[PDB]
Write a protein that binds this ligand. Structure first.
Ligand SMILES: *[C@@H]1O[C@H](CO)[C@@H](O)[C@H](O)[C@H]1NC(C)=O
Lengths: 640, 96
């Protein structure tokens, strides 16, 4: 009784290439296959892209199609579904999948970050699709007042513009101040909107940047020395500043800011560096709660005002978010799988972070039990830990604690997790572990997964291959077999990681046997791998000259751009005084990758309650003619 | 200014077609009206996405059976030998 399976992304998209991997396990001879998609309910958006399966490919194929968007725009407030009904020879299998309206991203770039009234606004609107490629679509833009009333409306097409839409606006003279907003959204999907904020203010450009970085990015509550903050001031163009600097400290809880009257100090800066300390007596007396412990959680904030001895220019710089904490580390379980397998290593990805949020570097972690295990964090703040598991059904209570030296035991950071066992089909004890290296992988270097297996010797001849899939950015990227000769128990599959795998790929896998009374079963696994976040291509700007540095104003210089052939670059030069005055709402690769990762369908970093759970966690939909099919999804976001 | 429709949580009891023409009508009418109501109210998200295909298959089977049971004069009755019934023909017209 051969099976026929369809594996498709859990939520479909409009006007994009969506892949549906087709397998026919234990099938003899060629089988025609036709895939048709119909609207749900009712009945034919597309019925094209049929295929012929051959044993030359080991009976595996993929059918890619792009569903037209039309019936789709009539109703949007309630989720809409489509039915993917495919016929394998004379056997028909169908599955209802959700369809989203999101079709691409709009990254808005404004040249400056603060404008004065009577000055023109120059901004661009990049148009890219889910795969980060230029697309031709129609956009709408509305520029909002501080109160939120549109002031300008426009419609543009990205056709033949290579995904860049330069635009303009001349700010009216009589306008309200404060944050403005620019909201742009694709014309087909008006319920998803992207935005940026630019500030209209009365300003004249400053002359020098003031940096306040405390010695530690926190304040120990029991430290008797007080907060140690260093104020440094350098001119814009690279010279040291002489002046006098006022500073002040306060306690920032929730949204109310209270200042410390006994804290303002004048600390003259010589050679552009000054240091002031907030004695703990001041901190305790300023607040009305003498209990020092009850002050934890609240954040300090440093407001530094610098004036030159000329007295001609004044600049303000503020560093907030200095958390008052009793422990310098915060242990997170965001990346650790929440489900494990009996009798396998259970790789823990602990994420040791500083109290502010930045990743921690070179900190030893340990497990409270079996203290013989100890590790040390990598560059990105993830420490690989391995805990062997007894073959038992009881939930495993894993607690991890930081064991840094020269830190008192009443001062480390602790955390606890509950991990539940993978549940087989009818207690058959047929699992699959998929061991792998997880590090700051760079594109190009290979990876060796370990298709580890565990099953009784009575059924070691039925399994001869391992199917695997690779999610990335929301669509299947690669899908192939992995042959394994019977009698072999570990299989290493070399994976060629190109630059196309940025930033993460959710490798899955499965096999299929018949056992017990002769009922079909499926066993799956998942792995989340984090790749270093950089371009899929490469671009960098440097200077043509190799001599006679510090160009004088009015002098030609040549800047060299080393970009990929055929590409198009867009340039902008901003005075650094603007960033001194307001450094928020910039654009960089980090935010682009954050936005792309925030839209991934998968919603758990690997493993699951069982095979249906594993597939839904990955963001897939595995249905078969026999009946073993994944659970239905009808919500855009997985539960928090 | 509107009244919320039934959540259809308890409408799960709504039968495979079988029997003669009258029994086939008895089978199809509740299932057909239930699927029509669910389509109108757009509440398939919670009643269960999979059951609609089975409902369509069974109603199509019943429709094909009654198409086979149609008299040569385009008449619907309990039996082909039995005289056609006007009420049965009108009900079949309404169902179609
Ligand atoms: C199916 O996936 C393979 C992966 O190597 C790819 O080469 C092929 O183009 C895909 N099929 C289609 C129709 O795109």
């Amino acid at each position: 009784s051969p099976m026929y399976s369809i594996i498709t992304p859990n939520i479909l998209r409009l006007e994009s290439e969506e892949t549906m991997v087709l397998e026919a396990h234990d099938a003899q001879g060629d089988v025609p296959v036709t895939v048709t998609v119909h609207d749900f309910p009712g009945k034919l958006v597309l019925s094209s892209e049929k295929t012929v399966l051959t044993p030359a490919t080991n009976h595996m194929g993929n059918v890619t199609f792009t569903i037209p968007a039309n019936e789709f725009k009539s109703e949007k407030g309630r989720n809409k579904f489509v039915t993917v009904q495919a016929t394998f020879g004379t056997q028909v299998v169908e599955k209802v999948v959700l369809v989203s309206l999101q079709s691409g991203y709009l990254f808005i770039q404004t040249d400056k970050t603060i404008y004065t009234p009577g000055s023109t606004v120059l901004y661009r609107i990049f148009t890219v699709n889910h795969k980060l490629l230029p697309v031709g679509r129609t956009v709408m833009v509305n520029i909002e007042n501080p109160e939120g009333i549109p002031v300008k409306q426009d419609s543009l097409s990205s056709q033949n513009q290579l995904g860049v839409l330069p635009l303009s606006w001349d700010i009216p003279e009589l306008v309200n101040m404060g944050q403005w907003k620019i909201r742009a959204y694709y014309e087909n999907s008006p319920q998803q909107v992207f935005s940026t904020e630019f500030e209209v203010k009365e300003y004249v450009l400053p002359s020098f940047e003031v940096i306040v970085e405390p010695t530690e990015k926190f304040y120990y509550i029991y430290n008797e020395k007080g907060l140690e903050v260093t104020i440094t001031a350098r001119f814009l163009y690279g010279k040291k500043v002489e002046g006098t600097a006022f500073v002040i400290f306060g306690i920032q809880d929730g949204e109310q800011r209270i200042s410390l009257p006994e804290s303002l100090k004048r600390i003259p800066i010589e050679d552009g560096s000054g240091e002031v300390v907030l004695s703990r007596k001041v901190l305790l007396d300023g607040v009305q709660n003498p209990r020092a412990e009850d002050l934890v959680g609240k954040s300090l904030y440093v407001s530094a005002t610098v004036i030159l001895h000329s007295g001609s220019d004044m600049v303000q710089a503020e560093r907030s978010g200095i958390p008052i904490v009793t422990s310098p580390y915060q242990i997170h379980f965001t990346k650790t799988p929440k489900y494990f397998k009996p009798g396998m290593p259970f790789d823990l990805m602990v994420f040791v972070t500083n109290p502010d949020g930045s990743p921690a570097y070179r900190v030893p972690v340990a497990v409270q039990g079996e203290d013989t295990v100890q590790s040390l964090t990598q560059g990105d703040g993830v420490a690989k830990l391995s805990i062997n598991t007894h073959p038992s059904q009881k939930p495993l209570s894993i607690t991890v604690r930081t064991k840094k030296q020269e830190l008192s035991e009443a001062e480390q950071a602790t955390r606890t997790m509950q991990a539940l066992p993978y549940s087989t089909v009818g207690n058959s004890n047929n699992y699959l572990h998929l061991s792998v290296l997880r590090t700051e992988l760079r594109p190009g270097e290979t990876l060796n997964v370990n298709f580890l297996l565990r099953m009784d010797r009575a059924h070691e001849a039925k399994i001869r291959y391992y199917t695997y899939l690779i999610m990335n950015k929301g669509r299947l990227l690669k899908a192939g077999r992995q042959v394994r000769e019977p009698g072999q128990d570990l299989v290493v599959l070399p994976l060629s990681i190109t630059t196309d795998f940025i930033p993460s790929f959710r490798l899955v896998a499965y096999y299929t046997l018949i056992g017990a009374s002769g009922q079909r079963e499926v066993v799956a696994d998942s792995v989340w791998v984090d790749v270093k976040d950089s371009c899929v291509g490469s671009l960098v700007v440097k200077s043509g000259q190799s001599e006679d540095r510090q160009p004088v104003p009015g002098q030609q210089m040549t800047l060299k751009i080393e970009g990929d052939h055929g590409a198009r670059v867009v340039l902008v030069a901003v005075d650094k005084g603007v960033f001194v005055l307001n450094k928020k709402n910039k654009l960089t690769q980090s935010k682009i990758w954050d936005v792309v990762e925030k839209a991934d369908i998968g919603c758990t970093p690997g493993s699951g309650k069982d095979y249906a759970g594993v597939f839904s966690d990955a963001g897939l939909t595995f249905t078969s003619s026999s009946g073993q099919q994944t659970a239905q999804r009808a919500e855009l976001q997985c539960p928090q | 200014m509107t009244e919320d429709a039934v959540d259809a949580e308890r409408l799960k009891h709504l039968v495979t077609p079988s029997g003669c023409g009258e029994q086939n009508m008895i089978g199809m009418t509740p299932t057909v009206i239930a699927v029509h109501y669910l389509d109108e109210t757009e509440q398939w998200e919670k009643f269960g996405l999979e059951k609609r295909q089975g409902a369509l298959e069974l109603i199509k089977k019943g429709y094909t059976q009654q198409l086979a049971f149609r008299q040569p004069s385009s008449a619907f009755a309990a039996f082909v030998k039995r005289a056609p019934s006007t009420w049965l023909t009108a009900y079949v017209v309404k169902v179609f």
